[model samples]
Target chain A: MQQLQNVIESAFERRADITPANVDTVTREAVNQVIGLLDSGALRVAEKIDGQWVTHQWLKKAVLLSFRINDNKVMDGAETRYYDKVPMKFADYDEARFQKEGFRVVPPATVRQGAFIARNTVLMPSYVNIGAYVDEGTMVDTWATVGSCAQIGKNVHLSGGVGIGGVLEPLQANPTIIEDNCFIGARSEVVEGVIVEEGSVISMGVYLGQSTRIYDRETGEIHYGRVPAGSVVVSGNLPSKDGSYSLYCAVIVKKV
Target chain B: LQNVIESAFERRADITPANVDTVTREAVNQVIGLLDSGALRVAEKIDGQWVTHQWLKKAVLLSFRINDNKVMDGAETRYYDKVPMKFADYDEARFQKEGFRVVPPATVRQGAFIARNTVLMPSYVNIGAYVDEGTMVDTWATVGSCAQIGKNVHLSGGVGIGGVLEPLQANPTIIEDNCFIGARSEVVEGVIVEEGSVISMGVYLGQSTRIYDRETGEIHYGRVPAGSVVVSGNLPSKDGSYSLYCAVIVKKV
Candidate 1:
């Protein structure tokens, strides 16, 4: 694994200088092999170690290069067609494969290639983009979008219409991370590489961006980019100088 | 169409639309055609009032009963389901004449009416929904069953306009003309969002949601009045331990 990682990193260093025409067969093979590892859950974009989440930049770079090297093809569905570079994860799935995988992908649950969906994850009419990692027992609910390269932890209930934002380039932009046992409520958005710590409950209509203030009401402290563990967060406003309050902050009402 | 729908309603208990009975199948087909051609609708606005054609909704429901599952073609994937996609046989010319842009992965079930010039960006419009002209149903948005979406409306990315199907006579969700439903918002449980309203991001409006009007200090429920610009807010909890989430009417346009 270490040797493969080194190979991917070396290839990605010259990514700006290479395209489909200039890229060699070995480099393309290595990139595709890494993507296969990502699909099979052998490689993940991020992982929680001790207490902090560390991103593996080389894996993400491999996913990006997979797109650059691949050519477009038409994916025809029953009477409908999609022309894209990445094929769906369940594009070749059958009843036998589905049973073996032990995951449920309801109709139109679009999981792009290179994303890993662990067993028992119920994907309801949602979109899981490339390089995203959704762990076991998670529910990617109706109309939700697991954006490119986002990391979702185990037993996380991403409720209806939630958006876990994604990032692609520079190998520096961290992907959005929702740690284990979080219940992200309906229509909420965790965007711009924010992290929701383990066991947090983000209530309906809570939009957490990188810059949005998270007010821990219990401690009267403010947090940004990452939600504290076991916090119950909801949408709230902060007072402006001119009498009226503006939409400013997300409030941690409780730590449960 | 009216007679067929009325017949379906009368025999709804005994007849399942999914069943392959010849009479029921014929009636269902007729009703679906009427819905497809815009000759019949689930709901309509007349003289400043929205009237639901319950029989048409019944026909839509009956469609589920009459149809059976079949393997549908997809790009490298096959969908084995009962409902057929609207663009199943649509060529570029057909789409051009229909005057809509259906970006890939958008699924519109049969019995939905999408008017001319509407841009559907990988969204889902379910059975009996009416999406009028020039609307933008953005990426990952869902227009639920029997929901009525008015003209030039912008249903932003990840917005969920909930569907109402049961009780037969119950009103479905309505987003009137020119409304801007912001990203990641949801209006569910038969709520009516009136014309020209701008609902900001992360605003979830359900029937039991407390909609506080800051301008007048009045509270409204189940509906947002015409031309309201609403945002997410919270009210002081009765227990005083925490604030309860609510929708605040910050301005009226």
Candidate 2:
């Protein structure tokens, strides 16, 4: 593991030298080894340190670099054709492998090659993109999307039509984070690098972005970029300046 | 077909299509064929008025009781279900002829009618649904059971135009032509979104939701008026202290 990690570190250091034309077998093996570690839950893109979720930027770099090293190919099936750089995680999974994995994946669920889904996680007919980490006992409900490099914590329930936005372009931008035991209701979108802290209950039809003003009714305090721990958020409106309709805001109705 | 369907409904408790008479079997087949060929629809607009063809909807309901489950294998996985995929037998020629591009993992049941030039992007259209031409059902979007979507509608990512199956006489959700239902939005409970309405993201509309127009101060319910631009907001609590969410009609398109 140390050898592979060192190789990955070295490759990342010389990333400009590592393109599709010049990528060697050793580089591909090292990157694949790191992905294997991620797939098996041996490594993750983020971890809690001193109560702060620290992003391992180097690991995320490896994941992004994978796309440049690999070439797109055709994945054809009965009446279906997919042309993509990454393969679906279940592309080679048999019943035995699924049983050993201890996860419930419904039909048509697409998990890309780099995500880590912990045991007891039930993935409905949804899409979990590359570099996302979904923890144990989570229910990624139908039609929900876990975007690239997002972090979803344990026992969280992301209801139908939910979107946890991913980030990769601005390499240093934080990925959307949903902490443990959160309930993101149906038709709600938590995007633009917002953090939903533990035990928060986001009601249906609420859209939270980086600039969304979250007003806590109890304390009369406004929160931005993050929902406080154990907060209960809902969609509400703030009065506009022109004496017309109000604009959208996230209201903290209660402390759950 | 009507006589056969009515008789099946009369003796529905004991009557299964396989166990029924030959006339009933052929009648069921004929009805499904009509649905597949776009000759019959659950609802239609005639002279600018929406009409519900209850009998056609009944045929859709009857299909579930008669069909049996089958195993469908994929590249490395399998789906065991009663509803056969619409594209189960489709090839390049068939898709080209059909004039729809079904990206991989997009699912449509056999009873649904998707018209020419529609693009399905990994979405799901359930039984009895009708999607008109030039519409794009985007990724993770669901056109629910018996729902009706009009032409050139853009159901964006993770949007759910809800379905209705039980209470057989109930109206299906309808989205009129050229409606742009935004991302993560849901229109459920048989509500009708009228023509050319632009529904913004994260707006949820159901039968009981209050729809308020800011300019007129007029309140609407269950239906979005034609040519309206709606966004998500909340109505103030009656006591003037708190607020709960509702749809606000910000502009009329």
Candidate 3:
């Protein structure tokens, strides 16, 4: 606890939480300071774990802190549909530290709002946007992204190479839709208010965007519309409705 | 010679013959595996270096044994400590011969276990951690330090399972049994996922957002129901890009 307090205090001194506009600059300065000290082993600060000065968990934390600092500038312009919600308790602690030292830093984990029941759900060290829902034993692979206010269903695997079609650019669009038991393969993408129904397996290397017609092989049916249940689907391009872009061809295809 | 070959072949008859042919067809495979297994030696001549096939057979056999999974202890196989590139060498052949395959020199760091029945596609990397049986590490996927993977789970290509290895005792991501993770998905904060639920592609869950359910347009956030299928999702792309990253529960019938 004492060590944590020191970490909080020192961290706050380095970069205080003022406002979003100022956050990037402060984070950059403090992170650079720590990163410079990294090679010197000065930041190899130890903790008395099991009554011994062990430095394992803290090292990753330090690395993350430094990384967060360095990344602040680079990712400042990156768009994210959502961000993690800071729990009141944990947020209060961070606020307290910030009040003492005039800066806020990386806070601790709070109790997650809901429970995820999926067994195969894998998580990267990402900051999930708040108020989202995840279901049954599904794998959430690395570098795979999830946007805010979104909803997902079971047996569906998210490949780690693309985004699930988010349209927050207009900032008024609702969340994306992926139906149940669908497999979104790697490097393939889904976007633009599309709905993928149940039992559909999108292969690797395909992208699903809005306004693209997803064709059903068994049914000989092509749809740019909502996804139906019990369909095995993948993607391809669809021709532009306006015929501006070569008609969007090559969209997700599945046999009904 | 025939008996030895047959015994080796019998150990892995599960592999399709066409795949075996594909592996053997690789011009560089015999050389790479032999070299990595300490088979290749160049004797110096007055003008240049001369090659020998003395340990070639032994090296090939060793490589075969590694691929066969007969010599591995599951917990103690000496995996290289660096991530190897897929398509570097021996992936298709390994898949054909070993039931699953990976890029050579593909590193599995210390304290990590790649379980049985798990096929490693190329460009897959596993940091120090324990991956359970019957799982598939698809193309370009990464398993970070100390992450605990479960059985019969299919991790789609490019999936990232975060590892919390610094604390040494820090718990890694615990993936329960029989789950399917979609492509490009992210789950962090050492979250515990119960069995038989699904996480859709592109959904990134951290330690704050509640994994909720959406039924008939009404959202129910904050519950971990059993055997739930959760899609971390989004709508289809306007550009048709992959945007599936929200977690929603669908009750399994």
Candidate 4:
């Protein structure tokens, strides 16, 4: 593990000079090997240690270095064609192979090759980008997007039209994570690298962002960047003065 | 089956494939075909009020009752479903003549109606849904089953107009003409957004989500009034310790 991490760290430092044509075989194979490990759930982009989540920056760098070695190619979709650097995960899957994987991919669901989807998971008409990790028994519902390298926990229900931020879009500090037994409601977005603890329920019509104020009702404490474990979160407003409108915020209503 | 299906709907739970007569089958098929070709609608403004055609809605259910699910032959992943895509039989000339642009990977069911000059960008339209002329359904947006979207409307990316059955859980809408719905918004549980309303991003509407009027101090449910400019805001509880989620009418057009 250290050897692979060392290779990616050195390559990522000099990534500006490296291109698809100029990259060496050793560095290329190491990066590809790291991606393969991520694809199989053997290597995770982030993991919990001593109740704190740790980000493996080298693994994220390996995903970033992947684009430098591959070029775009045309791929087939239902009634359409797509061009992308990474091939789809289920491109060669038949019914037998799908049965072995124990995951269901409904029509029009697109998952890139490097994403890890464990057994007993379901992907609806959703998009799972490269290097993302979806654990066992999770449901990515209709039109929801599990962004690049986002960490989704077991038995999590990301309802219809939910959006989790990608690793590269905001240059995220850590991978946006939903720990085990969490259910994110429909049309909601988890933004700004917000970390949701285990057994929590994030309600619909809510957005959890860093700048958005989170007010805890009981203790009158304010939270940001993370949701406390087993909390039920909802959208709310905080007032300034009487007879006037209030600002949008989030509230920790109760414990689950 | 009567042309007005009120008489046929009496035995709604009793009808099936083997015992049912061909009269109902043909009538249901004809109505669905008309919906596909935009000759009929499930809902429209009658006497200046939005009135649903109950008979037409029955046809949608009756078709499902009689039709058997079958395996769909496609390139990626096996699909076993009752409905097929609207563009299954389309070609270049057909699309060109229809005057609508359906970009790659957009899927509309066979019984759905999309009018001319509309651009569907990788979206989904379910069965019996009607999208009027000059509308744009942007990327990852969905018009759920039996939804009514008016002309010149814009549904931004990742929006969900909930289907008829689920009302109040982050899905649903009857978007009237010329409305601008911002990104990531949802109108769930059959809430009606009146014509010319401009709904900003991050605002969701449903039966339970309070639509608060700041100027008038009124709280509305199940509808957004016409010409209202709405954004997400909150109202304070009696104790003033926490604020509850509500939509505010910032401006009126």
lDDT of 4 by residue, B81-151 (tens): 87766777665556656777664466788888989989876678998899999999876889988799999
For model 2 the local lDDT of residue B70 reads 71
Q: What is the interface RMSD of each candidate, in Å?
A: 4.2, 3.9, 17.6, 4.9
Q: Which candidate is the best by TM-score?
A: 2
- TM-score of model 1 (first chain only): 0.94
Better of 1 and 4 by TM-score: 1
lDDT of 2 by residue, A108-174 (tens): 6878878989899999988887788999999999879898789999999999879887777665677
Docking quality (DockQ) for each candidate: 0.20, 0.17, 0.02, 0.16
Expressed as tens digits, the lDDT of each residue in A69-109 for candidate 3 is 33111001011111111222122345554354332222111
The number of the candidate with the highest DockQ is 1
How much RMSD separates candidate 4 from the native structure?
8.9
Q: What overall lDDT goes with each candidate model?
A: 0.82, 0.82, 0.46, 0.81
- Candidate 1 residue runs with Cα over 4 Å from true position: A1-75, A82-162, A165-188, A192-205, A209-213, A216-249, A252-256, B14-24, B69-81, B237-243
- For each candidate, give its TM-score against the true structure: 0.62, 0.66, 0.33, 0.58
lDDT tens digits, residue span B128-232, model 1? 888999999867889999899999999977889999888678789999999999778899988999999999777889999988888787999998999899887
Model 4 per-residue lDDT tens digits across residues A195-226: 99999998887777666678999889988889
Q: Give the TM-score ranking, best first.
A: 2, 1, 4, 3
Structural RMSD, model 2: 7.3
